[model samples]
Target: PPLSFHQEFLCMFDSGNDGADVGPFGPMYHIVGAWRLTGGIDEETLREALGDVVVRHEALRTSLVREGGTHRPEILPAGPAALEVRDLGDVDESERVRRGEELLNEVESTGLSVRELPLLRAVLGRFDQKDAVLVLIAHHTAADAWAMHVIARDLLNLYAARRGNPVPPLPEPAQHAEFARWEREAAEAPRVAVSKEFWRKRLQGARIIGLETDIPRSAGLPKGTAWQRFAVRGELADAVVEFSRAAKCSPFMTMFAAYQVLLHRRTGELDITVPTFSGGRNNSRFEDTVGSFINFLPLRTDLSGCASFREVVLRTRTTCGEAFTHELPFSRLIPEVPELMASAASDNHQISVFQAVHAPASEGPEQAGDLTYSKIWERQLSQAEGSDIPDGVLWSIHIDPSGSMAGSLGYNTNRFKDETMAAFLADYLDVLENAVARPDAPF
Candidate 1:
């Protein structure tokens, strides 16, 4: 088969001068997830199930090849993504979680080369032959958050089937190449042009906003990145959900408005343009497809007046409405606003963005035959180690599957201290809780 043109977003990454060859691993771009399993699982059996998964999803077998200025997906019958089995049976149960954290950070800190076919990997972290944690990492070029869930469900389903259990039939898996073809066709549509025009004017004079930092950004590349995740459960999380329902807007909008308020107080910038992503699976055909179907969008909002937080949410509802309607790929939208460049273009400050992902807090432990799995949480403790977050601080809010919310601040380690980030997150939660109580109160 011919090389399928890379999606618009993928093409954007190839702007590197290295050009027609493998791109530089300047930034880490991979999605990582893990599930702790408590029941016995045979390594060989799990491997076979994983092999079936790769074969079932063409995206898993896809790689990139540059033709002139563009990179395209070249699909081949790739081999099974190998699973690295590490035995931690010697470690006590008390030490397993910490060891697992160290293992996860180590996996993420290591980069995946774009030249490799089947840009994905798995690690079976076994405390014993009967129990283990399944860790998966895939190049962001090929998968998104929703795609990760799809992979998880499918892997478990296949594992159950392989172990002599009844598993529900899945719909014919959608091919990502088909989605790529559709995007190209859609680009030529009159509506696409209209959307482009809409964005061109909507973001005509927008500025990339970064929060006030205690230290200046380094002139050279930093050794690594830093991240800390804080949870917002109990009353605050419930308040956020209740307010969203009362306002008839999304939980994301409510939390996002709160974040804008936090940013305003931090930087005193009335006009803020924070880059974020949306699972670009708007097309029903690609809804369940495993691919990097995420579109980067600017959640530009004006929290000018010391306006009531409720008012910000109201304004946020409008912003979300207009932005999503014209949700073109960020790569395409950038040309319309040339003033918006990478932080390298301006040393004054780094460009920053915020994202809020409302994860289904409803999901409990999942089962595959007799095996059961639960989620794991981990993070890097120092700049001496851990994965990188592209660009400036990425504030990610997760409304977890339990209806509670938590926040993470992924920042450049060289530019900020842990204490600084922790304070900022605390202030954000404070702002959020205050807004939850008095939506109409002045910030």
Candidate 2:
């Protein structure tokens, strides 16, 4: 069967590209999740559990193969899941956290191959009998951030059942191939045609906004992704929540508006277009399915004659509502506005994406029979060589259940300097603080 729209979009960078390995990003994109596990774990049971997950989710055993001139998903026979158990000698209890972070960086830097069957890999770093860190890396082609949580939940449940715990059987999960079929059939619907026309008229002459890089790509610098993490805590975090409540919008809407303000100030463009990711899981049937279901959406807004930050938020809210209401796959929308991404054609400029991650809520550590595990959300590792951002910049923010917000700014090292990105984050926080504090203030 043909690849999904998301998969086809990813293959654009992989097909006929000579610098796939040494490019701005790796040929194979992957997502990583680390969890601290408590209680003794049975290695054999855990391995069997991992295999069960692969067998249950067909996406795990699917591979991308080039047929004729396009790529297709090839499902291979189910096999034993790959597991690597590393014994990192015991250290002081206080140093365990640091060691776990180092392990995550090591695994992420060493990514997986796209052609590898069972597009998932698991590593267990045992510090002692009851203290260990479990890391799972899934190719981005198969899983998004939301799917990572589902994978963890299912894997642990299966592991507990295999360990002689009374765990209920998991429901049958929908396959990614089924989703590909649905997407193709849905495109023929009348509503999709209306969406295509809406995008055509909305983005008639709009160009995507790209950040001006301090360093040009012609410098022949090494290409890699660098990250800088920041947090919005205490009063500012409270302000964001309070402001969102008053404005009747999600915290993402507020933060995204501030980003648009930053772009307006930096590039004096009244008509702004920024791309963001949409968790394309509108269909409940594919909720538990693991595949690349994220869509790249370009939101265009006009800030002409806006007097206050409050007005900007309202405009942003309206723009977002409309864009999401008529959301279509980027591959489908690009045909409407062929020049929408023209700004990114230059070597010195790159588009920036802003998205607030919507991860599943968890009060604390979740129980899987005898095992209790919690996700490692706060990244202790400051730098990494390989990340999933294919190009340009990606600004991702995660608002914790406690109302505190944390974010990471990832950019291409080949076109941006570390100091530049650092200052950029600081400026964003400053803008956010000011905007939230004085909602009615003039721009």
Error of 2 at 291 (Å): 0.7
Tally clashing residue pairs in candidate 1. Answer: 6
Clashing pairs in 2: none
**TM-score of every prediction relative to native:** 0.88, 0.94
Worst 10 residues of 1 by lDDT: 18-27
Task: Give the alpha carbon lDDT tens digit for every residue of 1-443 in model 1.
Answer: 33323355445444354522222223366777778888778788888888888888888877766566655557778685477899867577768877776667678777775556657788888988667778888877777767887887788888888888877877787788788778778877888889989887888788777555545654544435677767776888888888889999888888888888888878878887777777677788776688777677887788777468888999899999999988886767788887865542245466666786522243678776778877674333322344455546777776665676655677776566789888888898898889899987667
Q: Worst lDDT window (10 residues) for model 2?
A: 19-28
- Can you tell me which runs of candidate 1 are displaced by over 4 Å? 1-27, 65-72, 90-97, 212-218, 342-344, 358-362, 377-384
In model 1, how large is the Cα lDDT of residue 143?
Answer: 75
Task: Point to the candidate with the largest TM-score.
Answer: 2
List model 2 lDDT by residue over 47-112, tens digit each.
988898888888888876556655567888777766899987699876888888788877887767
